[PDB]
Structure formats: structure tokens, C-alpha cells
Amino acid sequence: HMEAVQNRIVEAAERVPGVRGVIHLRARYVGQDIWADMIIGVDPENTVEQAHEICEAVQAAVCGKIRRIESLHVSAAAR
Amino acid sequence: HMEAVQNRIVEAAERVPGVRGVIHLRARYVGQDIWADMIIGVDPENTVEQAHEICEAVQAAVCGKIRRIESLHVSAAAR
């Protein structure tokens, strides 16, 4: 059930230090696996490097909590 | 002729303060118009806000120089 999984993805991403909401999430099933692409909000005053670190942290947190995800790309934008 | 136009796009983007190369460019014709998506390199120590400013500057510079472009999305990544 896809919406239960999308809710978990958003919730997991929001628990990571430096996340200021989920701006966009597209998730699809490839068989029983999820492939997802996400855009997180960050403080516009973070550096590009810090934003990259937050994205990597989100990728790790979300993939760790949701075992069916087999591909997750995380980008950032000011909010 | 597409490659002449791609070269112009890259050259125009590289002339904008804060651009550290063109990491990716995908350009396609929709009729006689170009639709393009680009990723520029930036200083990892720029803020997210500064990176956004550079992207907007690139969009303005490239669209101003290359009149056939009707859609241009510019994102940034550390280099």
C-alpha cells in the first residue's frame, strides 16, 4: 500500500536534523521495490556542503527505516 | 544544429560569476525551440541562497544570449 509508505518516507525525512519539510516526493513500485526521488527544504543560510550532508543523512535514515526502498535520490532547496 | 547550440549554452553559463563548470546539460528541440535542463558546479562553501542566485543569473544570461531557448531549468551542485 503506497500511501502508507509515502507517509513513512516523509515522516522519516522530517526527523533528520536540518530538514525543513519535504517539498516533493515521487515514489513508484518496480515490482515489490520502491524507487523514489525527493526534494527536502533546508535553511537558505546553510552552505551547499551542509545541504549535501543533510541529503545524505536523509537517504541513510529513510533507506534504513523503509526496507523496500531500493533507490532513493535526495536533493535540497531553500525554505 | 544542436551541438553548436549546446556549446553556446555551456560557454554562456561559464561566463557567469560563481559558475564552476557545467556538470550536466540536456537540451532538446520542441519544434524550432530548445527546452534544456542544466546542473552547474558551485563553491561548496557558498550558501544555498547564493547558489540559487547563481542559477538565476545563469538562466537570465543563457536565455538572453540564445534566443531559441524557451525553457531552461538550472540547478547547482558542489564542485
Numbering used by the authors:
A (entry chain A), B (entry chain A): 213 to 291
Any passages from the paper?
One group of metal ion efflux transporters that regulates metal ion homeostasis and can be found in all domains of life is the Cation Diffusion Facilitator (CDF) protein family.
Examining this closed state model, three putative binding sites were revealed, in which Asp, Glu and His residues from the two monomers are brought into close proximity and may bind divalent cations. In contrast, E289A from the peripheral binding sites resulted in a significantly lower magnetic response that correlated with a significantly lower number of magnetite particles per cell (−17%; P<0.01, Mann-Whitney test). However, size and shape of the particles were unaffected in E289A mutants. Furthermore, only the D249A and E289A single mutants revealed an additional slight decrease of the magnetic response during iron induction experiments with iron-starved cells. To confirm that these observed phenotypic differences are due to true transport function alternations, we also examined the expression levels of all MamM mutants, their ability to stabilize MamB expression, performed MD simulations for dimer stability evaluation and determined their CTD structures. (ii) All mutants exhibited an apo-MamM CTD-like behavior along the MD simulations, and (iii) an absence of structural differences was observed.
